[PDB]
Write an enzyme that holds these catalytic residues in place. Structure first.
Site, short mmCIF file in Angstrom:
data_model
loop_
_atom_site.label_atom_id
_atom_site.label_comp_id
_atom_site.label_asym_id
_atom_site.label_seq_id
_atom_site.Cartn_x
_atom_site.Cartn_y
_atom_site.Cartn_z
N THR B 92 10.47 26.09 -39.32
CA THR B 92 11.27 24.85 -38.85
C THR B 92 10.69 23.97 -38.20
O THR B 92 11.09 22.74 -38.15
CB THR B 92 12.20 25.66 -37.84
OG1 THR B 92 11.64 25.60 -36.43
CG2 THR B 92 12.85 26.81 -38.32
N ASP B 395 11.51 37.46 -40.03
CA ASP B 395 10.80 36.22 -39.40
C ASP B 395 10.24 36.76 -38.06
O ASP B 395 9.30 35.97 -37.86
CB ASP B 395 11.70 35.13 -39.38
CG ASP B 395 11.76 34.26 -40.42
OD1 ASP B 395 12.28 34.72 -41.59
OD2 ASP B 395 11.64 32.95 -40.39
N1 LIG Z 1 11.50 30.52 -24.72
C1 LIG Z 1 11.17 29.26 -25.24
N2 LIG Z 1 11.02 28.17 -24.56
C2 LIG Z 1 10.14 27.09 -25.21
N3 LIG Z 1 9.91 27.28 -26.30
C3 LIG Z 1 9.89 28.03 -27.07
C4 LIG Z 1 10.24 29.29 -26.52
N4 LIG Z 1 10.20 30.19 -27.49
C5 LIG Z 1 9.63 29.72 -28.64
N5 LIG Z 1 9.23 28.32 -28.32
C6 LIG Z 1 8.58 27.56 -29.33
O1 LIG Z 1 9.44 26.59 -29.85
C7 LIG Z 1 10.05 27.42 -31.11
C8 LIG Z 1 10.78 27.06 -32.07
O2 LIG Z 1 11.47 27.90 -32.93
P1 LIG Z 1 11.08 28.49 -34.66
O3 LIG Z 1 10.28 29.72 -34.38
O4 LIG Z 1 10.30 27.48 -35.09
O5 LIG Z 1 12.53 28.80 -35.36
P2 LIG Z 1 12.68 30.39 -35.43
O6 LIG Z 1 12.38 31.13 -33.85
O7 LIG Z 1 14.03 30.36 -35.71
O8 LIG Z 1 12.01 31.22 -36.55
C9 LIG Z 1 8.53 28.30 -31.34
O9 LIG Z 1 8.60 29.54 -32.30
C10 LIG Z 1 7.60 28.26 -30.32
O10 LIG Z 1 6.19 27.81 -30.20
F1 BEF Z 2 10.85 29.44 -37.24
BE1 BEF Z 2 11.77 30.39 -37.58
F2 BEF Z 2 10.92 31.27 -38.53
F3 BEF Z 2 12.52 29.94 -38.38
#
Ligand SMILES: Nc1ncnc2c1ncn2[C@@H]1O[C@@H](COP(=O)(O)OP(=O)(O)O)[C@H](O)[C@H]1O
Ligand code: BEF
Ligand SMILES: Nc1ncnc2c1ncn2[C@@H]1O[C@@H](COP(=O)(O)OP(=O)(O)O)[C@@H](O)[C@H]1O
Ligand SMILES: Nc1ncnc2c1ncn2[C@@H]1O[C@H](COP(=O)(O)OP(=O)(O)O)[C@H](O)[C@H]1O
Ligand code: BEF
Ligand code: BEF
Lengths: 525, 544, 509
Positions: B92, B395
């Site tokens: 994402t 994921d």
């Molecule tokens: N609790 C949080 N607060 C702020 N930023 C966060 C937090 N948790 C994760 N992030 C950052 O932003 C996130 C965005 O979500 P993402 O992993 O890209 O999609 P998903 O978690 O659905 O697979 C990252 O994984 C991370 O580095």
């Molecule tokens: F970034 Be998660 F995998 F959507």
């Protein structure tokens, strides 16, 4: 193979029925559609939405009564709350948003009450009994000293909030021109006289207000017109300046040479005769309102007399009320008791446009004045005249006693009312309690709606105001340009009382109609 | 005009128009999923233009369902599905970084910078950016405690975020506890993972992990036992397809003079059963084939009270046999001459019970010789959710694997992406001149993520990010510690907070493979100035 | 390709689409919930109140609306009674949780706020617990019977159901071993409940009518084999080089046929049930052994007779065993008038239970079993989990006044969430009153006072005047139901509340 459900009871062509409860859920939402669009529009720190006419014209406003004015709706229910705002903008200038805002919300909150178990009749009486208490309670919640009207002192204090609402950021300069054009009408007073004339060029801050109306036209008589005078006495009249033409059937017949050889001369005679007659009277300027004759125009240019082409029948009046003269059909027979003195009738040009004026008076001082608005956008200059007409309507109310009673606007009152209306329903036995505690929280609009505009965490603004019932005035409000919750008293920000009452009534009236209807039989095409 | 070649259907855009069309095409695929990331982020629903829906917050899967029209957009979709291979999470986000890199890069050549200069301005800023990761990730080698944190940070900005802490362990434990292999002297956790199912209906929180595999199958004949537990059970993963037997092709059968057509008719079936018994005689507590058992060969496995499963998943009987110590047999013959079977082929488990889960039933296999079996059986309201719940699983399981396969981890939450922002521009700008303005944008393009983590919250967040700046810039400059840096964004509650103090933590690998590929994509498009697009093959439509 | 609606502007279209489906179920509630005649395709035409079938045969365009209509069957399988209610709760659960979305900070603060809800509520849903004896189940099985067109004979069914449940007979009873024939005509009280298996199988032995109409103490053999001249599985071809090897081959045919049943009669069989039909030859050679034979029996059917009779189905008669034959009392093929039917019952300790019904048209009968299932199942729910809840919407009002209590006792901006979940559970009984009003609203506050200091139980009667007390009234819904119905109702909304954008196309690419 089958099947197919037949039709229970037929009718003509096509018609649309609506079960009442279902319609209320369904139409209460239609209503709700134009709500979220009118929320962001109300208040200074808000937003303006563009609209393209069915004719293609482009329009931008903050006013919600105009948003709908340019909007072609279909929903018979929404039609109502639109008829509301519109049926107010005419009677009372400002307050057109508090109409929709409440109306919509009233319906919104009534839902809960309708779903709980209440009935539309029960809901109506509930709200109604609140409209009588909310109208009266406010009649005393004022506390705002009903300032007496004089000069620009009280005017600028009231006329600003009416303006700072949509055209925020130019509140000061704007209203200045308003109050300016006002104090040129010697105090029963007519709102209509203050006309407005906007012309492209420069920034809005370069606008000006002249004692007298401006004409976007050139003086007739070609290069034979003066176009520049000093303290000249004018004489305006409707009847065509040319020869006396037969209103009914009429021509010109000649039998012998002597006839022809002289008929050509006869005209010239009468012509000069008519003109010089009016010129000797000391007439320094003839404002033609209908018809102009070149045949006799020969005379007027030579002595040194101006000539203002024939405006609109409705514009001659507002003009005359500036000069001091009086219109008079038929040519000739001028009456000094019908003549008027005009200070200056020069020909200045703004934005490179040939224009004549009546600016300034030594002098007799005009009874009607016009604002000259310079700008850079046709759209803005239009939604400035609006923020002006709003003002011109605020001075129209303060001019009719005793509406000159102030009131804590800026949400202040619209917040104190929350509790004041609660108590009424808090101490009124019956099922109508609920229908009242709702009408109360309905006024949560104005508060929140202001906060949500500035990015203020609404979850803090509301609680703060509740704590701040201060009752100092209040004394308690919210200014998007500070921290936490602001204080109405300080900013000198107060919304005229009667406008709020009109808004609080027209909404509770409209919202009741929407609630009252049970079935809607809409046609087709 | 022209003449050039060749129309129609074959055209080309030049310089500016392309460099723009490329950037627009990128912000397109980008700006769609720019809401997703961050705990404050939401999920979306995609319509199969036939009614059918699919709710998901995953960026990768979401972009796939988009269709990716155009080279520039599809290029990002391709970069997305790369991330899962590196990592599994952040798809994402990676798209965003890239998109922002182009957005800015072009906004520089739009300032007549010239691409060559820019393409290097990243080429360098990237290397130095990793050189700063050397200071951040290292301290995250030592800190089961911090593994449940990483598995939890992979929950937020997701459906299972509400039950984070709960599933945080269900994730860790199956891989940590029961999922380890070894090939050619290498220890790693299943990059192909451990069977996970979905239970229609039932409670959210009550998703049953299993101390064994969860082969999704039904008993061959109803006459067979529905369960065989206790201890030391005879498992047999037989891919022999012991159903029946027909003549070997090419080996026709012409008879005479007999009167012997029957003397071998049964003989065709006999040889089948003869092999069936030869196997049943070594254990036969439970039989698991891939091809399937036959009715005329089930009665035999039935009477002996031997659970038999007709035609199982081949990818399962492997993982199962690997844990029970058994041996997924291919052909009967073992050397010559052999029937054959040896009790040394059978497995070692504790219970083989066929459970039930709302109008459905699957056979479980609890306990094994080698204690490496895990299967998480989810359970929620609709398929619409129970599936997406799995997406957060596939994921999140990954984020851990990658972690436990690389000692280095990184303080996520906008922290890293913030340090680089300040560190390169303040400290990278040694070259100066024009190359500086490039490096600059490369750093600025990094803020893109921290920004959206905030903008996701309706409230004015322009300031919450401004603070993250000054804070992080504090590590060095300007104008024995204690180091006041290393903090991060607390999207849940406004204002900065040390991320390491919190469960939040992303694997260093993820912060690299994504930072790196986001560049190559960007570069590859920078070099573009003309896109010749020739029409396909039209229908004959011959007038003759 | 296509557009997409996102943000609150769409977040709404998700919610009001949810409420939309529930709107079509308000009538259905236990009390006077009126049957709904739903015409469907192809030419299907059903009628009843069973949610997971009134919605099932009702298609929906919208995504959210498609998630709701899914919870219907998502619930029916798990317990199988909370059909109408789960939808009515899931929906209203968002309606009274919506104005806390915009006025509320986010859609995610509400998420966490819902966990503390379902957790606490499930607790309160456990407080009102009753114990099932495991005769007296007839008390609870009455309730499933009561809503649908089973009330007229509430008694007759409750027994016909707990009996069918009683036969099997395993810790877990699979209603896959409980066939349900549905003969047209007679009287609804004529719906016996055989302890064997009823077959449309006409006069067995298609050769001639010689086979016994019924046999006392039959020793059955159920076969999945073919019982006909077997053909070489391995593609074989014949070559008659001889002059009279043709007649000898013809013989080899009738031969194997005799050798077939030869080793099947050795099990002293007097009646055989073969999944597949039998050749006329093998139909005669055994016929002289006075043994009955019925062929064409369904795969599933020959499993019901597998438990009833007791004999194990075996293939290839050659390896037949004494443990393959069974012990059942009789086999009489009585005519249902114009149409035959072979009955087979008896045998001690037998799991199978085929409950043939009667009454009116095939459609009438349908809705009978349709609701009968709701009964049969409702008892297993209570049987596998021996504990019950205070029905009549009382249980609902309980968790409502309990959560409501937790409301004020919460210090946070997410307070407005738990509140919502509560207010929505009050609506569960709401319609119970609105379906028998006027009027539902006055009675509401009545229960609030009673729950506060009127003890857990005591809900709304469906008679109905209004308030009553369920333990006294006798309407106890197995906790298992109410448990999951609430859980199904809350979680789906949570997934749906997590949505803020809708794309209108798929690759799938
Ligand atoms: N609790 C949080 N607060 C702020 N930023 C966060 C937090 N948790 C994760 N992030 C950052 O932003 C996130 C965005 O979500 P993402 O992993 O890209 O999609 P998903 O978690 O659905 O697979 C990252 O994984 C991370 O580095
Ligand atoms: F970034 Be998660 F995998 F959507
Ligand atoms: N400090 C302020 N001064 C003037 N108006 C304010 C101030 N703060 C908030 N407002 C809002 O601006 C006005 C309303 O906006 P407006 O678009 O004019 O609605 P309407 O014209 O229907 O009355 C006030 O009555 C108030 O609610
Ligand atoms: N007479 C009643 N009054 C109040 N609640 C009842 C009554 N009868 C049954 N209930 C409970 O309400 C429940 C929810 O309805 P459901 O069985 O799912 O569909 P339906 O009530 O239409 O058959 C059950 O019917 C039952 O446990
Ligand atoms: F909204 Be107000 F009428 F300007
Ligand atoms: F719909 Be009810 F359960 F019969």
């Amino acid at each position: 193979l089958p099947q197919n459900p037949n039709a229970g009871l037929f009718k003509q062509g096509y018609n649309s029925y609506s079960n009442a409860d279902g319609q209320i859920i369904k139409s209460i939402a239609a209503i709700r559609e134009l709500h979220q669009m009118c929320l962001t529009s109300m208040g200074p720190c808000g937003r303006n939405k563009i609209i393209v006419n069915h004719l293609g014209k482009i329009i931008i406003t903050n006013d919600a009564a105009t948003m709908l004015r340019e909007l072609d709706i279909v929903h018979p229910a929404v039609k109502v709350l639109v008829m509301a705002t519109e049926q107010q903008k005419i009677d009372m200038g400002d307050g057109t948003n508090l109409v929709m805002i409440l109306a919509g919300e009233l319906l919104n909150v009534s839902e809960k009450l309708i779903s709980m178990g209440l009935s539309a009749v029960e809901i109506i009486q509930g709200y109604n009994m609140a409209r009588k208490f909310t109208l009266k309670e406010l009649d005393e919640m004022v506390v705002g000293e009903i300032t007496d009207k004089n000069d620009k002192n009280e005017l600028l204090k009231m006329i600003k909030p009416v303006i700072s609402s949509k055209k925020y950021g130019s509140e000061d300069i704007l209203s200045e021109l308003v109050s300016e054009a006002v104090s040129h009408v010697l105090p029963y007073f007519n709102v209509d006289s203050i006309r407005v004339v906007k012309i492209m060029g420069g920034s809005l801050s370069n606008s000006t207000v002249i004692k007298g109306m401006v004409f976007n036209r050139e003086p007739e008589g070609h290069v034979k017109s003066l176009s520049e005078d000093k303290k000249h006495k004018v004489a305006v009249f409707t009847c065509p300046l040319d020869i006396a033409n037969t209103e009914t059937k009429g021509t010109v017949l000649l039998h012998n040479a002597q006839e022809m050889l002289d008929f050509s001369k006869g005209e010239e005679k009468q012509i000069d005769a008519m003109m010089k007659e009016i010129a000797d009277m000391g007439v320094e300027c003839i404002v033609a309102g209908a018809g102009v004759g070149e045949l006799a125009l020969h005379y007027l240019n030579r002595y040194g007399i101006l000539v203002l082409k024939v405006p609109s029948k409705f514009e001659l009046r507002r003009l005359c009320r500036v000069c001091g003269a009086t219109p008079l059909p038929r040519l000739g027979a001028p009456t000094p008791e019908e003549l008027g003195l005009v200070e200056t009738v020069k020909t200045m040009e703004i934005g490179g446009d040939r224009v004549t004026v009546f600016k300034q008076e030594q002098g007799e001082i005009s009874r009607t004045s016009t604002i000259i608005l310079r700008g850079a956008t046709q759209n803005n200059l239009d939604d400035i005249e609006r923020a002006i007409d709003d003002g011109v309507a605020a001075v129209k109310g303060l001019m009719k006693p005793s509406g000159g009673k102030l009131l804590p606007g800026a949400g202040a009152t619209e917040i104190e009312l929350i509790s004041r209306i609660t108590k009424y329903g808090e101490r009124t036995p019956g099922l109508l309690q609920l229908a009242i505690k709702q009408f109360a929280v309905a006024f949560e609009v104005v508060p929140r709606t202001l906060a949500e505009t500035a990015g203020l965490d609404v979850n803090e603004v509301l609680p703060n105001l509740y704590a701040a019932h201060n009752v100092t005035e209040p004394g308690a409000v919210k200014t998007d340009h500070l921290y936490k919750g602001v204080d109405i008293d300080g900013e000198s920000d107060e919304g005229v009382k009667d406008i709020r009452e009109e808004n609080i009534y027209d909404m509770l009236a409209t919202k009741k109609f929407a609630i009252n209807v049970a079935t809607e039989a809409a046609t087709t095409v | 005009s022209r003449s050039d070649t060749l129309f129609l259907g074959g055209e080309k855009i030049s310089g500016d128009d392309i460099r723009n069309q490329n950037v627009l095409a990128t912000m397109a695929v980008a700006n769609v999923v720019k809401s997703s990331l961050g705990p404050v982020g939401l999920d979306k629903m995609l319509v199969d233009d036939i009614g059918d829906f699919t709710v998901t917050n995953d960026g990768a899967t979401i972009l796939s369902l988009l269709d990716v029209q155009h080279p520039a957009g599809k290029i990002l979709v391709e970069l997305a599905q790369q991330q899962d291979r590196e990592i599994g999470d952040g798809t994402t986000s990676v798209v965003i970084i890239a998109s922002e890199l182009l957005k800015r890069a072009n906004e520089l050549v739009k300032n007549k910078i010239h691409p060559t200069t820019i393409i290097t301005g990243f080429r360098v800023a990237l290397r130095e950016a990793i050189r700063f990761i050397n200071e951040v990730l290292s301290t995250s080698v030592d800190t089961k405690e911090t593994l449940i944190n990483i598995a939890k940070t992979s929950m937020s900005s997701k459906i299972i975020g509400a039950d984070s802490d709960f599933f945080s362990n269900m994730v860790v434990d199956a891989l940590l506890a029961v999922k380890t292999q070894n090939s050619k002297g290498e220890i790693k956790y299943p990059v192909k993972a451990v069977n996970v199912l979905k239970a229609h209906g039932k409670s959210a929180t009550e998703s049953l992990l299993v101390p064994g595999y969860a082969l999704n199958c039904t008993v061959a004949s109803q006459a067979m036992p529905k369960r065989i537990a206790g201890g030391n059970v005879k498992i047999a993963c037989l891919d022999l397809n012991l159903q029946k037997a027909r003549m070997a092709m090419g080996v026709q059968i012409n008879i005479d003079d007999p009167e012997q057509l029957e003397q071998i008719r049964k003989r065709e079936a006999g040889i089948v059963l003869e092999r069936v018994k030869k196997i049943i005689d070594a254990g036969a507590q439970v039989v698991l084939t891939t091809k399937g058992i036959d009715d005329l060969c089930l009665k035999e496995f039935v009477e002996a009270k031997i659970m038999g499963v007709r035609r199982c998943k081949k990818e399962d009987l492997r993982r199962i046999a690997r844990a029970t110590g058994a041996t997924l047999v291919s052909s009967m013959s073992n050397l010559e001459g052999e029937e054959t079977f040896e009790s040394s082929y059978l497995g070692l488990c504790d219970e083989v019970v066929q459970a039930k889960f709302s109008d459905d039933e699957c056979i479980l296999i609890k306990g094994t010789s080698k204690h490496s079996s895990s299967s998480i059986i989810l359970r929620g309201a609709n398929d619409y959710s129970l599936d997406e719940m799995e997406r957060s699983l596939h994921d999140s399981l990954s984020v851990v694997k990658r972690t436990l396969e690389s000692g280095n981890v990184v303080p996520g939450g906008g922290c890293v992406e913030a340090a680089l922002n300040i560190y390169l521009d303040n400290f990278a700008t040694t070259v100066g001149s024009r190359e500086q303005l490039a490096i600059a944008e490369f750093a600025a393009a990094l803020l893109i993520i921290p920004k959206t983590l905030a903008v996701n919250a309706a409230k004015d967040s322009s300031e919450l990010v401004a603070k993250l700046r000054s804070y992080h810039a504090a590590s060095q400059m300007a104008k024995k510690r204690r180091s006041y840096r290393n903090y991060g964004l607390d999207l849940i509650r406004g204002k900065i907070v040390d991320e390491i103090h919190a469960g939040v933590l992303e694997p260093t690998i993820s912060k690299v493979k994504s930072l790196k590929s986001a560049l190559e994509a960007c570069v590859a498009i920078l070099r573009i100035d003309t896109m010749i697009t020739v029409d396909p093959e039209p229908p004959k439509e011959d007038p003759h | 390709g296509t557009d997409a609606s996102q943000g609150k502007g769409q977040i709404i279209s998700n919610i009001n689409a949810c409420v939309a489906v529930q709107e079509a179920l308000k009538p259905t509630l236990g009390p006077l919930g009126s049957d709904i005649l739903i015409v469907t395709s192809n030419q299907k035409t059903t009628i009843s109140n069973d949610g997971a079938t009134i919605l099932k045969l009702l298609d929906v365009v919208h995504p959210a609306a498609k998630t709701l209509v899914d919870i219907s069957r998502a619930q029916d399988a798990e317990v199988g009674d909370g059909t109408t209610s789960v939808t009515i709760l899931a929906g209203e659960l968002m309606k009274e949780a919506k104005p806390f979305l915009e006025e509320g900070i986010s859609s995610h603060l509400i998420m966490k706020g819902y966990r503390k809800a379902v957790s606490l509520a499930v607790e309160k849903i456990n407080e009102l617990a009753v114990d099932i004896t495991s005769e007296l189940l007839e008390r609870c099985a009455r309730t499933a019977m009561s809503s649908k067109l089973i009330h007229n004979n509430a008694d007759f069914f409750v027994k016909m159901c707990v009996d069918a449940v009683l036969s099997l007979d395993r810790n877990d009873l699979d209603d896959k071993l409980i066939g349900i024939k549905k003969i047209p005509g007679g009287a609804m009280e004529e719906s016996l409940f055989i302890n064997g298996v009823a077959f449309k199988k006409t006069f067995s032995y298609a050769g001639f009518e010689q086979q016994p109409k019924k046999f006392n103490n039959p020793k059955i053999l159920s076969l999945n084999v073919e019982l006909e001249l077997k053909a070489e599985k391995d593609n074989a071809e014949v070559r008659v080089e001889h002059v009279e090897d043709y007649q000898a081959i013809v013989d080899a045919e009738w031969q194997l046929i005799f050798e077939k049943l030869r080793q099947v009669e050795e099990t002293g069989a007097n009646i055989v049930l073969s999944k597949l039909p039998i050749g006329d030859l093998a139909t005669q050679f055994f016929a002289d052994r006075n043994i009955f034979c019925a062929g064409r029996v369904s795969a599933d059917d020959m499993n019901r007779v597998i438990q009833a009779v007791g004999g194990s189905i075996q293939s290839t008669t050659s390896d037949i065993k004494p443990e393959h034959l069974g012990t059942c009392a009789l086999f009489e093929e009585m005519q249902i008038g114009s149409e035959r039917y072979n009955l087979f019952q008896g045998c001690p300790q037998a799991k199978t239970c085929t409950l043939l019904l009667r009454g009116g048209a095939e459609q009438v009968i349908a809705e009978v079993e349709r609701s009968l299932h709701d009964a049969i199942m409702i008892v297993k729910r209570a049987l596998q989990n021996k504990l019950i809840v205070a029905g009549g919407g009382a249980t609902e009002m309980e968790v409502s006044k309990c959560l409501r209590d937790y409301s004020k006792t919460i210090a946070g901006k997410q307070q407005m969430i738990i509140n919502a979940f509560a207010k929505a559970l009050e609506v569960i009984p709401r319609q119970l009153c609105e379906n028998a009003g006027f009027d539902a609203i006055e009675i509401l506050n009545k229960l609030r006072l009673a729950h506060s200091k009127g003890e857990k139980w005591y809900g709304v009667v469906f008679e109905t005047e209004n308030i009553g007390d369920n333990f006294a009234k006798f309407v106890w819904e197995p906790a298992l139901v109410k448990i999951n119905a609430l859980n199904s109702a809350t979680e789906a909304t949570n997934l749906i509340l997590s949505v803020d954008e809708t794309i209108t196309n798929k690759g799938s690419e």
